[PDB]
Amino acid sequence: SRDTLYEAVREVLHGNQRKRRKFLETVELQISLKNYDPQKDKRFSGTVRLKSTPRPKFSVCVLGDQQHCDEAKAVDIPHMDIEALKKLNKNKKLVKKLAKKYDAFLASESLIKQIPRILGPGLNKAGKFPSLLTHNENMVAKVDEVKSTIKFQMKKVLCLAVAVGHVKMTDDELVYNIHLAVNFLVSLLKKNWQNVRALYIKSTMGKPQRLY
Amino acid sequence: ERRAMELLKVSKDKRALKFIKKRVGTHIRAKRKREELSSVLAAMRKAAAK
Amino acid sequence: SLGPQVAEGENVFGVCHIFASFNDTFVHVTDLSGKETICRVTGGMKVKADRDESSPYAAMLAAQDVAQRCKELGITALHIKLRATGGNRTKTPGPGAQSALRALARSGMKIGRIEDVTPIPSDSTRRKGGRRGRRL
Amino acid sequence: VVDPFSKKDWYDVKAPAMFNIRNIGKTLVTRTQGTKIASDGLKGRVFEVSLADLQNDEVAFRKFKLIT
RNA sequence: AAAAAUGUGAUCUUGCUUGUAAAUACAAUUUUGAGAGGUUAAUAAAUUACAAGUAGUGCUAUUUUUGUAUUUAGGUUAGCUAUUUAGCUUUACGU
RNA sequence: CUAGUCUGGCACGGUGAAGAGACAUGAGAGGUGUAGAAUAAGUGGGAGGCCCGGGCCGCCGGUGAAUACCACUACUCUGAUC
């Protein structure tokens, strides 16, 4: 459990061969896992926290019958109170497509009378649990929830992928994200000696190329 | 020292620590030598990368 | 233990050094040189008695067993080197060879040349025995 | 527990052109397994081929000795 | 068995993996008829139920209507063959 | 209990070739449960961006997560050794 040292961890400005598109790209962190069983009780999962979150692209489900409902319509999202929940019945799961369609949900003062129910755990470790600490109020912080925290999980492919960088925000805001990302990964890393094989570099879309 | 580098390549940390301890002496010297060999192993890995 | 050569054109040759003394019988099948063997049986394997190792029925059974083992490896024809006791004592083969040469013929083994390779001495040292001889 | 005569190849025995019949027979030869050489193991051997088997239309009582 | 939907953060009962059952004929019979083996057990085979992980899902888990009433009952699981008329397999496609 | 003697280990005291066994590196082939016109190749992908106003497959009908622009990966052979 020893991957480390920040003497020469710099000069990440070279992104001409990777990024030549019009829009802004997502530089991701991936790793190759070894000595891990996919099906049994071996579970590698956790919540890595960043301070300055660059740009996670994901959709947010918004529900409410208050001023939040009136102010969330300026985001130009298809917001709808009860017919949107009526559209998502128990038929879109019988249909083979995934009946989730949202990576985030709402937990605010409109649904605070409906939230204290028996429904507890779920996709909290997957990272689909709204809370008041991470700004899921959605009248002003709906735009700010585009910049949200990150999390990671495992599946049967036996690989890891998380979004830690974006070459809008400069690399001075991303280097501290790299510091905190590896600082939480070493702390959150059963007995497993040196799981870190090779940290990957990643952009939005493309072809393979080796650089550490 | 090249044998200790080969033990670092085949990743046997406990046997490498015991071997470096048997060669140089005390455990403080062995722990410092293991970290110095890991640092130059990372330097050689960076040199083999570019 | 298989023959890759053609079965119709040419049959696989070997030799058998048939040793037959008065109380011992070998059936030793070897190649044409003699350095590399194929199989070898003794009378003690068949009969658990040293008084009748040179038996005609046991020699017939041993010859049929060696012929079956030889057809398992795939050698069709055999030359017959008929050894005897030899030396300075006697020059007479045992009675088991007369049964064994008929048994290996009736078992289905092709017969080539038959000759003796008995170590016949011309002029040698003193024969084992006293002046008066074998008293009984 | 294994059969000894399993990994044995068969090499054909050749005669010089001054006689009639080219082929004589075959003899089990081990493969070239690493250090040892099959041609080195097949260095000194002596066969026994009669004159009637060597030359076709001649006498039969005479014999020779053929070294390989 | 298919359809309102308040819900339990909107939201279904898990084709997978791991631990448990307690089900899952005997005989004929290739050594062996008998008492175990090495059935069986333990305990990574599988169909059903429980819990975990998560491939399966926001765990746990909820409600209205329809399938009412043509309640039905009979029957096809229709063949192959022949130009047509028609002939005509208890279903062989090793038999 | 020892001179003396025997044996084993450590440094003095290296090299070239063949044979057997184990480990690692640079590369090229490399993926067909149901189903889909197609080795679903792979996950966060992305509805689009590349090149010279125009070029590609899409989103998806159908699979339990579908092609361009970012990584060598669970893993099967070829494979040259400072």
Curated annotation (Swiss-Prot), chain A:
Where does the record locate the signal sequence feature? Answer: none
From the record heading this protein, give the residue positions of the covalent cross-link Glycyl lysine isopeptide (Lys-Gly) (interchain with G-Cter in SUMO1): K113
Q: Which residues carry this modification: Phosphotyrosine?
A: Y6
SUPFAM superfamilies the record matches: Ribosomal protein L1
GO annotations under biological process? translation
The UniProt entry lists the main location of this chain as: cytoplasm
Q: Where is the protein found, in the record's own terms?
A: Cytoplasm
Cross-link Glycyl lysine isopeptide (Lys-Gly) (interchain with G-Cter in SUMO2): residue positions: K113, K156
Q: Which UniProt keywords apply?
A: Acetylation, Cytoplasm, Isopeptide bond, Phosphoprotein, Ribonucleoprotein, Ribosomal protein, Ubl conjugation
Concerning Gene3D superfamilies, the annotation shows: 3.30.190.20, 3.40.50.790
The terms describing its cellular component in GO are:
cytoplasm; large ribosomal subunit
Family recorded in the similarity comment: Belongs to the universal ribosomal protein uL1 family.
Role noted for this protein? Component of the large ribosomal subunit. The ribosome is a large ribonucleoprotein complex responsible for the synthesis of proteins in the cell.
Q: Subunit composition?
A: Component of the large ribosomal subunit.
PANTHER family to which the protein is assigned, alphabetical:
RIBOSOMAL PROTEIN L7AE FAMILY MEMBER
- State the name under which the record lists this protein: Large ribosomal subunit protein uL1
Q: Specify the taxonomic lineage.
A: Eukaryota, Metazoa, Chordata, Craniata, Vertebrata
UniProtKB/Swiss-Prot annotation, chain B:
Its assembly, as annotated, is: Component of the large ribosomal subunit.
What is the name of the protein in this document? Large ribosomal subunit protein eL36
Tell me where the signal peptide lies.
Answer: none
**Which span of the entire protein is present here?**
54 to 103 of 105
For the modification N6-acetyllysine, which residues carry it?
K9
Describe the task this protein carries out: Component of the large ribosomal subunit. The ribosome is a large ribonucleoprotein complex responsible for the synthesis of proteins in the cell.
Query: Hey, which family's this protein in?
Result: Belongs to the eukaryotic ribosomal protein eL36 family.
Organism of provenance: Oryctolagus cuniculus (Rabbit)
Q: Which domain of life is it from?
A: Eukaryota
Q: Where in the cell is it found?
A: Cytoplasm, Cytosol; Cytoplasm
From Swiss-Prot, chain C:
Compositional bias segments (type: Basic residues):
127-136
Pfam families recorded for this chain?
Ribosomal_S11
One Gene Ontology BP term is: translation
Q: Where is this cross-link: Glycyl lysine isopeptide (Lys-Gly) (interchain with G-Cter in SUMO2)?
A: K46, K48, K91
This protein's major location comes to cytoplasm
SUPFAM superfamilies in alphabetical order: Translational machinery components
Gene3D superfamilies linked: Ribosomal protein S11
Q: What InterPro entries is this protein classified in?
A: Ribosomal_uS11, Ribosomal_uS11_CS, Ribosomal_uS11_sf
Stretch list, region Disordered? 116-136
Q: Name one GO molecular function term.
A: structural constituent of ribosome
What are the Phosphoserine sites (modified residues) in this protein? S1, S124
Modification Phosphothreonine, positions: T118
Keywords associated with the record: Cytoplasm, Isopeptide bond, Nucleus, Phosphoprotein, Ribonucleoprotein, Ribosomal protein, Ubl conjugation
Q: Report the locations given in the UniProt record.
A: Cytoplasm; Nucleus, Nucleolus
Name the family the entry cites: Belongs to the universal ribosomal protein uS11 family.
Q: How does it assemble?
A: Component of the small ribosomal subunit. Part of the small subunit (SSU) processome, composed of more than 70 proteins and the RNA chaperone small nucleolar RNA (snoRNA) U3.
Protein name (database record): Small ribosomal subunit protein uS11
**Species assigned in the record:** Oryctolagus cuniculus (Rabbit)
Organism placement in taxonomy: Eukaryota, Metazoa, Chordata, Craniata, Vertebrata
Curated annotation (Swiss-Prot), chain D:
Residues with N6-acetyllysine modification: K14, K36
Record's subcellular location: Cytoplasm; Nucleus; Nucleus, Nucleolus
Q: What does this protein do?
A: Component of the small ribosomal subunit. The ribosome is a large ribonucleoprotein complex responsible for the synthesis of proteins in the cell. Part of the small subunit (SSU) processome, first precursor of the small eukaryotic ribosomal subunit. During the assembly of the SSU processome in the nucleolus, many ribosome biogenesis factors, an RNA chaperone and ribosomal proteins associate with the nascent pre-rRNA and work in concert to generate RNA folding, modifications, rearrangements and cleavage as well as targeted degradation of pre-ribosomal RNA by the RNA exosome.
User: In terms of domain of life, where is this protein from?
Assistant: Eukaryota
For this chain, the site of the Glycyl lysine isopeptide (Lys-Gly) (interchain with G-Cter in SUMO2) cross-link is K14
Q: Which family does it belong to?
A: Belongs to the eukaryotic ribosomal protein eS1 family.
Protein name stated in the entry: Small ribosomal subunit protein eS1
